[PDB]
Design a protein around this ligand. Structure first.
Ligand SMILES: CC[C@H](C)CNC(=O)[C@H](CC(C)C)C[C@H](O)[C@H](CC1CCCCC1)NC(=O)[C@H](Cc1c[nH]c[nH+]1)NC(=O)C(Cc1cccc2ccccc12)Cc1cccc2ccccc12
Length: 330
């Protein structure tokens, strides 16, 4: 079996993407952030503290005839940005894009932190990293991807995210019309539970490619591209009005600059981010300074290939017994 679903950026900056998911019988459709950096599917629900819900769509397990309480299990998760949520667990039927799994754990939020309540467009998260990072206790639960692989035509999903435009998640097949030239695959380490891999180097604009290993994770759930401090300084040293601003938290530049491209290596292949993708947008509406899409990961302690890098590629998450990651230009 396969499935295919459109994913849309939540705002005109592409700060994140949502994809509809149908939970329950009869279906309730919730718009989830698919996050290849964590492994929990949780949603806002009829159990979540009322005062912690600003316009999101909730799941009500008591209206689903296939939901069942997973007795004794609870979960609690915090993310790299500080935000957090906990709750208890039902299993229910969940379909994306046509592809149905029965018996998928749907973590029901009793509490969510203030970042979640304040964003009305995301009704919860569907995790697609490996199932070792799931927070359910005492027995961890598998992601939707792992429960699906028995039935999928092939054990893969692709992410094809758009720049200020919608894109696709596909499960189970690779669409050969979505990309140009051929996919290059590079090895995944799962030792810390992420789609973690090693890029072979970088180049800024039309200058030289420097071969240097940058170990990073492919994370659909992080908006920006976070790289080591000295690669990031080498890129903004080509943009004449760019500086590091302590006030705003990163490199900012004049919104009028044409930014150069940034190339990253995948084995012997090279993926080119166009400089307009790196112009994140202005620091405030009207302002003449904009915030850059490439920042230093020194503060996070791992390099993150997030949606600024990923949406310049068609990306295959190969979840065979030895996983790999595949990238093609598009
Ligand atoms: C079991 C624990 C595991 C480790 C869970 N995984 C992680 O925490 C991962 C860390 C891993 C890369 C090491 C990160 C994970 O993918 C997680 C998924 C998010 C969670 C919040 C909701 C949206 C999805 N991503 C993140 O935690 C990254 C982390 C980060 C660190 N520094 C900068 N960013 N956060 C994000 O990228 C934010 C957006 C964001 C955060 C911080 C600075 C930003 C600067 C400019 C633009 C965006 C920034 C996610 C986000 C996007 C859009 C709307 C949002 C509304 C509310 C809350 C978050 C929103």
């Amino acid at each position: 079996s396969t499935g295919s679903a459109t994913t849309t950026p939540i705002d005109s900056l592409d700060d994140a993407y949502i994809t509809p998911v149908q939970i329950g019988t009869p279906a309730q459709t919730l718009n989830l952030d698919f996050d290849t950096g964590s492994s929990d599917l949780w949603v806002f629900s009829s159990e979540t503290t009322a005062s912690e819900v600003d316009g999101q769509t909730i799941y009500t397990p008591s209206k689903s005839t296939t939901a069942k309480l997973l007795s004794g299990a609870t979960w609690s998760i915090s993310y790299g940005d500080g935000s957090s949520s906990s709750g208890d667990v039902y299993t229910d039927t969940v379909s994306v894009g046509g592809l149905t799994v029965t018996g998928q754990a749907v973590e029901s939020a009793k509490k969510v932190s203030s970042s979640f309540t304040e964003d009305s467009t995301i009704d919860g998260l569907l995790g697609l990293a490996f199932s070792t990072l799931n927070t359910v206790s005492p027995t961890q639960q598998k992601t939707f991807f792992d429960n699906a692989k028995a039935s999928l035509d092939s054990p893969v999903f692709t992410a094809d995210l758009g720049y200020h435009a919608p894109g696709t998640y596909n499960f189970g097949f690779i669409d050969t019309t979505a990309y140009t030239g051929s996919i290059t695959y590079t090895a995944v380490s799962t030792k810390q539970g992420f789609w973690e891999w090693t890029s072979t180097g970088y180049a800024v604009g039309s200058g030289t490619f420097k071969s240097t290993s940058i170990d990073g994770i492919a994370d659909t759930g992080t908006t920006l591209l976070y790289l080591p401090a000295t690669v990031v300084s080498a890129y903004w040293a080509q943009v004449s009005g760019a500086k590091s601003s302590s006030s705003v938290g990163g490199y900012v530049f004049p919104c009028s600059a044409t930014l150069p491209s940034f190339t990253f290596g995948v084995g012997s292949a090279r993926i080119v981010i166009p400089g307009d993708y790196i112009d994140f947008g202005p620091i405030s509406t009207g302002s003449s300074s904009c915030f850059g899409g490439i920042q230093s990961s020194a503060g996070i302690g791992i390099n993150i290939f997030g949606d600024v890098a990923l949406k310049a590629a068609f990306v295959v998450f190969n979840g065979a017994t030895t996983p790999t990651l595949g990238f093609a230009s598009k």
